[PDB]
Amino acid sequence: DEWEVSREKITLLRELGQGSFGMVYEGNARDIIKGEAETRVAVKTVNESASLRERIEFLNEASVMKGFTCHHVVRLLGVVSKGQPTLVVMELMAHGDLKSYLRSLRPEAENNPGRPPPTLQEMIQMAAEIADGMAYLNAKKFVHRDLAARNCMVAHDFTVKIGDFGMTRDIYETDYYRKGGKGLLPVRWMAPESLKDGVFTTSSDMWSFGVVLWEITSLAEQPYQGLSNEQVLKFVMDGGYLDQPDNCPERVTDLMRMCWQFNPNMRPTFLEIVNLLKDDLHPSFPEVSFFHSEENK
């Protein structure tokens, strides 16, 4: 209702790439944002051949997003749910996902924009933005379960935001989500206790946040390269973790190691990350952050 957008206002322009449950498109949306006759948007759709499970998860993801208002979380703008097909309209992120962005900054990248890799200050800013959006998600009582550079998105001014919630689960009642069994899973990002007990908490998100820091400082190499998926499962459950990338600033190394404590109780919280980094950020941060907001209570 409040979210419903009239279909005639949405025009699909081109493919951005296959999302969790179907193709995402760049589009044009008329009269969706007050003050803009027409806005360039991202539009998520469901594959016609999607399984019942995927159709359910797609709709549930859109539904979860309705509850979020955070500068560091990709914004839901509207839904077209009258007639066919369902369109999920969101904030277009001008520089796409963080993994693509990082890979483009490699010296040998064919798509190098003519900029060097991120500086220490830029890395710190990314870290704080990611952590701020995650702290918001946690305060909203959801666990992300799939935090990774590929699921963070980069805006026109290079602000990083949490951007994909295909595995996100409500934890209001218990503070954890548990699910064992077989699955196509982001093994290289997962905490030892998630792999062992199938348990997902804000601490297991923190583990993945460490891996995101590793991605930032390695320009999104594959974690545990030379190990198969099954070897990563064994390695990490037995107390293994990632080595430091070449020329990694010590400050980021220090954070990574805290994120990879075997015992989840020992890892930092996302608020603690923002707090640690808070004096080293762009002056706009307190004006837009969840951390510095009245809601952070």
Add this chain to the structure above:
Amino acid sequence: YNPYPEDYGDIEIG
């Protein structure tokens, strides 16, 4: 928006 199929593996957890 780029998908990364190699970032997932068929494993068993829990």
